[PDB]
From Swiss-Prot, chain A:
Membrane topology summary: Lipid-anchor
Protein name: Outer membrane protein assembly factor BamD
Species assigned in the record: Escherichia coli (strain K12)
Subunit details: Part of the Bam complex, which is composed of the outer membrane protein BamA, and four lipoproteins BamB, BamC, BamD and BamE. Forms a subcomplex with BamC and BamE. Interacts directly with BamA. The Bam complex has the shape of a hat, with the BamA beta-barrel crown in the outer membrane and the periplasmic brim formed by the BamA POTRA domains and the 4 lipoproteins.
Role played: Part of the outer membrane protein assembly complex (Bam), which is involved in assembly and insertion of beta-barrel proteins into the outer membrane. Constitutes, with BamA, the core component of the assembly machinery. Probably involved in transient protein interactions. Efficient substrate folding and insertion into the outer membrane requires all 5 subunits.
Major subcellular site: membrane
One Pfam entry name: YfiO
UniProtKB/Swiss-Prot annotation, chain D:
Lineage: Bacteria, Pseudomonadati, Pseudomonadota, Gammaproteobacteria, Enterobacterales
Lipid bilayer topology: Multi-pass membrane protein
Domain Autotransporter: 36-302
Entry's localization field: Cell outer membrane
Sites annotated Cleavage: 25-26
Coiled coil (residue ranges): none
Domain of life of the native organism: Bacteria
Residues of the full protein shown: 999 to 1300 of 1300
Name used for this protein in its record: Autotransporter protein EspP translocator
Transmembrane segments: none
From Swiss-Prot, chain E:
Subunit structure of this chain's protein: Part of the Bam complex, which is composed of the outer membrane protein BamA, and four lipoproteins BamB, BamC, BamD and BamE. Forms a subcomplex with BamC and BamD. Monomer in the periplasm, but is able to adopt a dimeric conformation in the cytoplasm. The Bam complex has the shape of a hat, with the BamA beta-barrel crown in the outer membrane and the periplasmic brim formed by the BamA POTRA domains and the 4 lipoproteins. The intact Bam complex can have 2 BamE subunits.
Its job: Part of the outer membrane protein assembly complex (Bam), which is involved in assembly and insertion of beta-barrel proteins into the outer membrane. Nonessential member of the complex that stabilizes the interaction between the essential proteins BamA and BamD. May modulate the conformation of BamA, likely through interactions with BamD. Efficient substrate folding and insertion into the outer membrane requires all 5 subunits.
GO biological process, any: protein insertion into membrane
Superkingdom of origin organism: Bacteria
Location(s) in or outside the cell: Cell outer membrane
Designated name of the protein: Outer membrane protein assembly factor BamE
Coiled-coil segments on the chain, per record: none
Family: Belongs to the BamE family.
UniProtKB/Swiss-Prot annotation, chain F:
One Pfam family recorded for the sequence: POTRA
Gene from which the chain derives: bamA
Source species of the chain: Escherichia coli (strain K12 / DH10B)
Subcellular location: Cell outer membrane
Protein name: Outer membrane protein assembly factor BamA
InterPro entries attached to this UniProt entry: Bac_surfAg_D15, BamA/TamA_POTRA, D15-like, OM_assembly_BamA, POTRA
Length: 213, 367, 51, 302, 83, 787
């Protein structure tokens, strides 16, 4: 009886518990060949997995959904949800360990989330989620920058000045518009100064003296 | 054994007569409950028997005596003594007893303390009966090979290569001699006949259809001797394909669907055979008409049904000797002289019948 | 959302100026954020209900 | 002779029986956690604190430590765990005539078997040595130390029935057989000889238990909470006491008791290497009822 | 403290074979891809060779290859010592 | 007649695309009754609908199709010696899973696959029946009935063609044997095919190693009986001639490392040619080139075999590539740890020549942290760069904030608890935060330690711990005095070498002594400074605040985490009281443990342990009695009580009225004895010296838990404790505690097993030279580390 299980699922999903509000959805999914009447079920399932914090299973289901019907009047919601799933993997908490987060830890989830939100923004700029993605995207470009800044700090503490200058080059070539790059110009100046590269040091000096922070 | 049906009830017909002057001597350690080709052969009314660990003995006609035990363990590891697995059975000819082994050794020993035996390396382990033909002892070794040996020590040895099915059921395919030519079943349904002098004119015929047909884990093996009648050989694959073949290197294949593991016996104008499920049936000399079927010993270890006094004598896995009539296949006499079953072909010759047992309790029948 | 609020928290991004006689590194990175002229859905309300 | 001497003799040979009840009480929760939540092996540690009260002003406070290791060996249609444990307990038992200090050290071997249908069977072989310090003052007896060697074979069989998902009902049967070396004290008070002794007795102790288990699942946490009611009783005699005194021969029958226990507790796993097992055991309608009993399951780090 | 290594490995024969006016392609073939670059304005390659063994002095050799757009007239500045 | 629309009737679990592709006609096509029959036959032949009925209701094709029913469930019945997990994954791997289409022929396919893996696992004589039960809404139930028979053991593996080696050792290389079962206790011996292929490769490698370079395997037959009670496998091989390697010739581009690789190449003549030795020298050439920056050397060794002389010549053609530079080092999987925490532990610097040894050292250090499950390194090239390479350390993060425990025991000596939280990586910041708690029958100690292992990038560690300590008034070879201590210490420790580490720190302690027993070993210290306590009255208090400079040195030349076998570990710990506190003294302790092997395999090895302690006051003050040394038990002289060897307490007479619950204490019966009471109680002393000479012997038990996890030891242990401030001139008739004599000397046997909880130590010692009535500890037992 798909109609009554779907109706009960909607009513106990809107204002009900979510632990067993995916059970009838997955029972409908296993029963059906994923053919007719399953698009709303799949979208409801992705939303339920997200807000139930089932991030890897939601990501697997959304990876499956994108290839089945890459053309859809709600594929923008799908890609936006995929970016949200990666950014929620980026922020481990709830018995997790944090304090400054992926500004100094694994940035692969943030980088995947950035690629996905960039696919939103340059695929469907007229979508009503894109602004949110466009302003999430900025945070991630700051996030991904702070990561390399920590590497540019640690090698500065170590004296690996080739590593410091190459990391700050990575900044200026990939993240030139962010704050963590501005914080990293003094490290490139220092690394050039502990070498006899005083021309490169004064060349970075005018950049850091371009009223930048 | 296949357990397609459950073990069927066995009706008992009491026989007030037991075989006379009948002895049950234990040969070696016995073969146990494992199936192999080790079965005594009688020559000069003298029984020759063999067992694993290379243990060969002989027995006299009545109250088996002249028991000369010979243990063959030489050339089987010069650092330790190990049981040379004999699995080629016993064939007797010209006072020479030929035995195979699973260390690729063919033993040929003599009468009257044949401790002095000549042994030959054969490519692959020897598992079939070393059948004799025109002064050559030829053997089908489970490397898919056919080899020939001379009677004295082996000087004219020629190899015939067969198909490699890579999945086998203990190739027991002992060749048969017709018109000076040896005809054998293959290890996967390639019945071939070759002459002597290098075994030329190698021609193969396909009989089995279960080889390479998604039925292969260890199935589709022709483990039966292709008995020749009137220039016609009868080949039985493991699964179906009971085919009749003409010994003129022809391509005419006419067949009936029956699969077996043990030898079929053709007597007069009749055929008695045991299927792969251990039930006996009878058929015409030419054709596929099932004259009768006895269904009273299903999936109980049965050997080749041997004809003694015009009566089918068979041995089950619980040590009952069954005399069965040969017209409709009904039990007419039952004897219990052994409490252990039988898993090796009995032999009927020289007015005697020889049955070898799991425990080596060789029983003699003189009715 | 499932985690903390993350679509209002941000930091403004600003270009770096190039002093004459030299240039910034060629910004060939694929982390460019294209400009959007859409209406905001940011704040507290964001409908992520599957349509 | 004296009533105090007879009550001391009965109390000191009821202390070993009470300790035997306490040590058989704690095997089942070492097996329950394996069924509820377990990995490919276990390196476990248990701390258990118990306080009990019984007639004659008999109050026992005891601390029980044990450590063990078990390995899982998968077999076709069978989940078997084999392990061994080293255990020590220390108890102070006070009665209006004496004070006893019991230090017990033992080694146990446990083998458990799980079926896919929820039916399971397990056994324990436990060899233990008890060193016991008894201070008794009724007519003058002082402090004495003695050692007792005890062997246990305990077999349990349970069945898990899932009437609903995430919750289950489990009947279980425990049968423990003990072989206990006797102890005899012979002395001379005021020039008159007092002897007291117990015969080697083998008490068969049986429990019939029913446990209702509910489960709560999380993203990284799993809490299995059980409520188990069990009938505990002794089928054979628990031993007797023989006193030889100037008045002759006195026989004291052992205290035979049957009780029901509400074994209510929970085992929580809040993180992949952070789990706990809490148990609260309370007795009722019996001569010896534990005031409280607390358990913790820990170690298990990877 | 651990030994610290930085930049391209330079040997005396790899720099003696770098002479005035060749192309940067076989320079990258001989000395390898430089771990430095001048991202600002002109293309300049800095072959830096630093050991910091940790218990003794820091040793740097700095080889600056300055090239024009055509990659000719190798402006070679070799400093075999840290000043 | 003319097709106008396609009506889908009864389609529940079938997609429209499959039906549209499967039908042989299109819209507008001429369709007759023959075309309807052809459409029904094609739709039935596609294996998508069990039943197909196409009707022409005018110009409309009504297609009533009963699909292939969706599997409602897969149920196994009669499973007494088979589990449903391998069954279900085998079914899913066979292309059949719950919900998929099921055909009539797929019953034969599933039966054949399941029976084939039954014959693979040896559960023969099994008849597999797949029975079908219908269910509405296009559902099916496939139940498997098993007529299971006996299991089949390996009856024989026939290696035909052996003329130099016995089959027995070759079969011992196999895991498939006919001996008593060791991997089963209820069943019997068992067969598998993947181990057959693996062990065939082990046989070939074994003959190549023994010297047979012309070795070849001709055939492999699988031998199954129709009976199905025993298993045979024949491996028909051909041995070669035992070949002797004559010399190795290396040619190619060696990049100037020839004299380094030529000395690694070539072996003493007479040695047998080994394929494993050839692969090992190829790997060693690759590692040698990788050390200098060559990460991709084109290396292959090819031999000529001269069968006339039985000789083998090796050409190891080696081309050294380009000296690869680490462009970037990346960490993956550190979802909850600072990349600084992972990058501190690395010896390969970014933007440097690749040190393959340095990369391996980084991996070994990351493993040594203990924060990770698995550490993997893939030195992957940079696309478009012939000289650059990116090093990636894929780490699987495991949280390490796990509860640990440890317990000891001794006969008549009580138990010891060592519980604790040991979060070894706090929030991924690489801070070790631990709360440890030790409990005895006389002592409790709680500690909160916060350690930053890298206060400086060189490896300087800053560790501060807050400790609370309490000693009871229980009879455990220690005097009755209620003292509570609490302190905080901060230690900065730095490595001056890869085996030498110094430590220096400051520690504040507070001691509160309440109601100490009147006794002249500590009353000498009480008379040295502070107030003057009243004899025969313990109603007294003593509060001290101490500021101490702690220092130390640790030399670690040992090897192996399982069991030390060589090198000396020295731990010097000293402390001098800073001026400006209530006490003034200094302690020095030296803990040395030397392992020396007298065996090439290190089976017999010698351990010398020695513990020196000397503490003495500064100026007119004296050694505090609560910082005395003690000896006895585990980690010191064994066979004696924990902390029982040394000066024995000399009690003053004192009143029976005590703050302690019991008045049955010695020397306090009603008013105390008329003279000083000699007690067997241990108070320690200013100085101590312990020395154990011990011999490690290999265990006789191997192959069940192996001899690398169990160690057997035979030891002699000497131990003395004495106080330099004891004055026997004014104390006659009492044992002299000023002399360093009275060296209590014992010996015993010990067994150490590595339990997965931690080290487990069991010792049986015997004290056969004891003094002044010490206590024996014939059994000594411990689990884990006390920390």
């Amino acid at each position: 009886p798909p109609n009554e299980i779907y109706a009960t699922a909607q009513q106990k999903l809107q204002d009900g518990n979510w632990r067993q509000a995916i059970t009838q959805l997955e029972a409908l999914d296993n029963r059906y060949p994923f053919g007719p009447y399953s698009q709303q079920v799949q979208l409801d399932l992705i939303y339920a997995y997200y807000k139930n914090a089932d991030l890897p299973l939601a990501q697997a289901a959304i990876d499956r959904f994108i290839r089945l019907n890459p053309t859809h009047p709600n594929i923008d919601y799908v890609m936006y949800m995929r970016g949200l799933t990666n950014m929620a993997l980026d922020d481990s908490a709830l018995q997790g360990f944090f304090g400054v987060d992926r500004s100094d830890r694994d940035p692969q989830h943030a980088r995947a989330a950035f690629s996905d939100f960039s696919k939103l923004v340059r695929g469907y700029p007229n979508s009503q989620y894109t602004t949110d993605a466009t302003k999430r995207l900025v945070f991630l470009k700051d996030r991904l920058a702070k990561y390399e800044y920590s590497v540019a700090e640690y090698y500065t503490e170590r004296g690996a000045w080739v590593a410091v200058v190459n990391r700050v080059e990575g900044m200026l070539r990939d993240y030139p518009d962010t704050q963590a790059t501005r914080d990293a110009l003094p490290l490139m100046e220092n690394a050039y100064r502990q070498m006899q590269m005083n021309a490169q040091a004064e060349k970075v000096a005018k950049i850091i003296a371009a009223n930048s922070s | 054994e296949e357990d397609v049906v459950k073990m069927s009830p066995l009706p008992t017909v009491e026989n007030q007569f037991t075989p006379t002057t009948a002895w049950s001597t234990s040969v070696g350690s016995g073969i146990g409950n494992f199936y192999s080709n080790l079965h005594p052969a009688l020559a000069d009314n003298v029984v020759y028997a063999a067992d694993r660990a290379g243990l060969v003995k002989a027995l006299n006609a009545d109250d088996g005596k002249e028991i000369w035990s010979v243990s063959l363990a030489e050339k089987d590891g010069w650092f330790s003594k190990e049981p040379a697995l004999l699995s080629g059975g016993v064939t007797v000819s010209g006072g020479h007893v030929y035995i195979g082994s699973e260390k690729a050794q063919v033993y040929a020993l003599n009468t009257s303390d044949g401790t002095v035996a000549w042994q030959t390396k054969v490519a692959g382990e020897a598992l079939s009966r070393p059948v004799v033909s025109d002064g050559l002892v030829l053997i089908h070794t489970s490397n898919g090979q056919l080899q020939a040996l001379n009677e004295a020590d082996g000087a004219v040895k020629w190899t015939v290569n067969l198909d490699m099915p890579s999945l086998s059921l203990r190739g027991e395919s002992a060749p048969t001699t017709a018109f000076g030519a040896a005809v054998v079943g293959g290890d996967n349904g390639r019945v071939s006949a070759v002459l002597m002098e290098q075994g030329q004119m190698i021609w193969q015929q396909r009989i089995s259809q279960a080889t390479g047909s998604t039925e292969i884990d260890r199935l589709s093996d022709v483990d039966t001797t292709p008995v020749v009648v009137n220039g016609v050989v009868f080949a039985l694959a493991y699964n179906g394909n009971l085919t009749a073949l003409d010994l003129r290197s022809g391509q005419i294949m006419w067949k009936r669907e029956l699969g077996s593991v043990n030898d079929f016996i053709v007597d007069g104008n009749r055929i008695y055979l045991v299927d792969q499920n251990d039930r006996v049936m009878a058929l015409t000399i030419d054709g596929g008409v099932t004259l009768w079927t006895q269904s009273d010993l299903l999936h109980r270890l049965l050997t080749s049904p041997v004809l003694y006094n015009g009566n089918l004598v068979v041995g089950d896995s619980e040590g009952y000797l069954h005399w069965i009539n040969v017209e409709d296949g009904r039990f007419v006499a039952q004897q219990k002289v052994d409490s252990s079953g039988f898993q090796t072909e009995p032999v009927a010759a020289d007015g005697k019948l020889l049955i070898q047992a799991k425990d080596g309790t060789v029983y003699s029948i003189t009715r | 959302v499932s985690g903390d609020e993350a679509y209002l928290e941000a930091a403004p991004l600003a270009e770096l100026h190039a002093p004459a006689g030299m240039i910034l590194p060629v910004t060939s990175g694929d982390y460019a954020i294209p400009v959007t002229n859409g209406s905001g859905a940011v704040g507290k309300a964001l409908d992520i209900r599957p349509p | 002779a004296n009533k105090e001497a007879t009550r001391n003799a009965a109390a000191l040979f009821s202390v070993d029986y009470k300790a035997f009840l306490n040590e058989v009480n704690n095997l089942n929760k070492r097996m329950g956690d394996l069924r509820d939540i377990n990995g490919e092996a276990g390196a476990w540690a248990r701390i258990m604190s118990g306080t009990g009260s019984a007639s004659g002003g008999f109050s026992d406070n005891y601390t029980h430590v044990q450590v063990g290791v078990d390995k899982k060996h998968e077999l076709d249609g069978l989940d078997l765990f084999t392990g061994f444990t080293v255990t020590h307990t220390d108890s102070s038992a006070s009665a209006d005539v004496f004070s006893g200090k019991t230090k017990s050290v033992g080694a146990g071997l446990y083998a458990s078997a799980m079926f896919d249908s929820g039916a399971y069977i397990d056994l324990i072989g436990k060899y233990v040595h008890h060193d016991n310090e008894y201070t008794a003052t009724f007519a003058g007896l002082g402090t004495r130390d003695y050692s007792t060697h005890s062997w246990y074979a305990g077999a349990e069989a349970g069945y898990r029935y899932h009437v609903t998902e995430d919750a289950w009902i489990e009947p279980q049967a425990e049968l423990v057989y003990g072989s206990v070396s006797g102890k005899q004290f012979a002395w001379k008070d005021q020039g008159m000889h007092l002897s007291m002794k117990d015969k080697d007795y083998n008490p068969l102790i049986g429990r019939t238990g029913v446990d209702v288990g509910k489960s709560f699942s999380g993203k990284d946490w799993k809490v299995t909470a059980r409520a188990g009611l069990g009938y505990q009783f002794d089928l054979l005699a628990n031993g007797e006491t023989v006193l030889r005194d100037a008045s002759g021969e006195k026989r004291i029958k052992g205290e035979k008791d049957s009780r029901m226990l509400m074994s209510v507790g929970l085992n929580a796993e809040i993180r992949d290497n952070v789990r706990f097992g809490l148990e609260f055991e309370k007795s009722a309608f019996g001569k010896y009822n534990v005031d409280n009993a607390v358990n913790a399951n820990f170690r298990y780090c990877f | 403290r651990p030994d610290i290594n930085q930049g391209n490995y330079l040997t005396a024969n790899d720099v003696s074979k770098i002479r005035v006016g060749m192309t940067q392609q076989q320079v990258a073939y001989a000395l390898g891809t430089p771990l430095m670059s001048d991202p600002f304005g002109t293309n300049t390659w800095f072959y830096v060779f630093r050991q910091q063994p940790g218990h003794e002095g820091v040793t740097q050799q700095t080889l600056t290859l300055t090239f024009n757009s055509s990659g000719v007239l190798t402006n070679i500045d070799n400093k075999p010592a840290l000043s | 007649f003319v097709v106008k629309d396609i009506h889908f009737e009864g389609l529940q679990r079938v997609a429209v695309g499959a039906a549209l592709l499967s039908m042989p006609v299109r819209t507008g096509d001429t369709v007759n009754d023959e075309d309807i029959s052809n459409t029904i036959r094609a739709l039935f032949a596609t294996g998508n609908f069990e039943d197909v009925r196409v009707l022409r209701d005018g110009d409309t094709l009504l297609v009533q199709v009963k699909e292939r029913p969706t599997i409602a469930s897969i149920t196994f019945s009669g499973n007494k010696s088979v589990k449903d997990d391998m069954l279900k994954q085998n079914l899913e791997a066979s292309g059949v899973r719950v919900g998929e289409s099921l055909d009539r022929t797929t019953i034969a396919d599933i039966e054949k696959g399941l029976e084939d893996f039954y014959y693979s696992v040896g559960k023969y004589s099994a008849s597999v029946k797949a029975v079908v039960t219908p269910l509405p809404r296009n559902r099916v139930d496939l139940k498997l009935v098993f007529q299971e028979g006996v299991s089949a053991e390996i009856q024989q593996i026939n290696i035909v063609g052996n003329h130099a080696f016995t089959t027995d050792e070759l079969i011992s290389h196999f895991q498939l044997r006919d001996e008593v079962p060791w991997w089963n206790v209820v069943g019997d011996r068992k067969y598998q095919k993947q181990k057959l292929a693996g062990d065939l490769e082990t046989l070939r490698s074994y003959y190549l190693d023994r010297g047979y370079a012309r070795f070849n395997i001709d055939s492999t037959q699988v031998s199954l009986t129709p009976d199905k009670k025993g298993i045979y496998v024949t491996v028909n091989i051909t041995e070669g001639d035992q070949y002797k390697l004559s010399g190795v010739e290396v040619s190619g581009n060696l990049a100037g490392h020839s004299a380094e690789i030529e000395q690694l190449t070539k072996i003493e003549p007479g040695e047998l040619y080994n394929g494993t030795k050839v692969t090992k020298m190829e790997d060693d050439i690759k590692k040698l080139l990788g050390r200098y920056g060559y990460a991709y050397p084109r290396v292959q060794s090819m031999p000529e075999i001269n069968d006339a002389d039985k000789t083998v010549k090796l050409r190891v053609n080696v081309d050294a590539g380009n000296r690869f530079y680490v462009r970037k080092i990346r960490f993956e999987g550190n979802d909850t740890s600072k990349d600084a925490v992972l990058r501190r532990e690395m010896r390969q610097m970014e933007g440097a020549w690749l040190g393959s040894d340095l990369v391996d050292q980084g991996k070994e250090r990351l493993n040594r942290l203990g924060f990770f499950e698995t550490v993997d390194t893939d030195t992957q090239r940079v696309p478009g760069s012939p000289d650059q390479v990116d090093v990636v350390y894929k780490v699987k993060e495991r949280n390490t904030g796990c509860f640990n425990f440890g317990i000891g025991y001794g006969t008549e000596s009580g138990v010891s608890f060592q519980a604790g939280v040991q979060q070894d990586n706090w929030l991924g910041t690489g801070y070790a935060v631990g709360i440890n708690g030790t409990k005895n029958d006389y002592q409790t100690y709680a500690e909160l330690s916060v350690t930053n292992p890298y206060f400086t990038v060189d490896g300087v560690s800053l560790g501060g711990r807050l400790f609370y300590n309490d000693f009871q008034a229980d009879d455990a070879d220690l005097s009755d005095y209620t003292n509570k201590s609490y302190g905080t210490d901060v230690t900065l420790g730095f490595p001056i070498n890869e085996y030498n580490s110094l430590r220096a720190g400051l520690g504040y302690v507070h001691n509160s002594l309440s109601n100490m027993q009147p006794q002249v070993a500590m009353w000498r210290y009480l008379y040295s400074m502070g107030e003057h306590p009243s004899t025969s009255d313990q109603d007294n208090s003593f509060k001290t605040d101490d500021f101490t400079f702690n220092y130390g040195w640790t030399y670690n030349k040992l090897d192996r985490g399982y069991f030390p076998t060589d090198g000396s570990r020295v731990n010097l710990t000293g402390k001098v009281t800073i001026p400006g506190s209530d006490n003034e003294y200094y302690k020095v302790t030296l803990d040395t443990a030397t392992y020396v092997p007298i065996d090439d395999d290190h089976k017999w090895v010698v351990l010398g342990r020695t513990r020196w302690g000397y503490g003495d006051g500064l100026g007119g003050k004296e050694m505090p009695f609560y910082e005395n040394f003690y000896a006895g038990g585990s980690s010191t002289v064994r066979g004696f009580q924990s902390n029982t060897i040394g000066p024995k307490a000399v009690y003053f007479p004192h009143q029976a009225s005590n703050y302690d619950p019991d008045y049955d204490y010695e020397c306090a019966t009603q008013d105390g004895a008329k003279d000083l009471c000699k007690s067997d109680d241990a108070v320690g002393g200013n100085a101590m010296a312990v020395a154990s000479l011990e011999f490690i012997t290999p265990t006789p038990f191997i192959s069940d838990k192996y001899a690398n996890s169990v160690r057997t030891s035979f030891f002699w242990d000497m131990g003395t404790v004495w106080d330099t401030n004891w004055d026997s001139s004014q104390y006659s008739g009492y044992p002299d505690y000023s002399d360093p004599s009275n060296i209590r000397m014992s010996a015993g046997i010990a067994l150490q097993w590595m339990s997965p909880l931690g080290p487990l130590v069991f010792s049986y010692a015997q004290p056969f030279k004891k003094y002044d009535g010490d206590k024996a500890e014939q059994f000594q037992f411990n689990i884990g580390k006390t920390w």
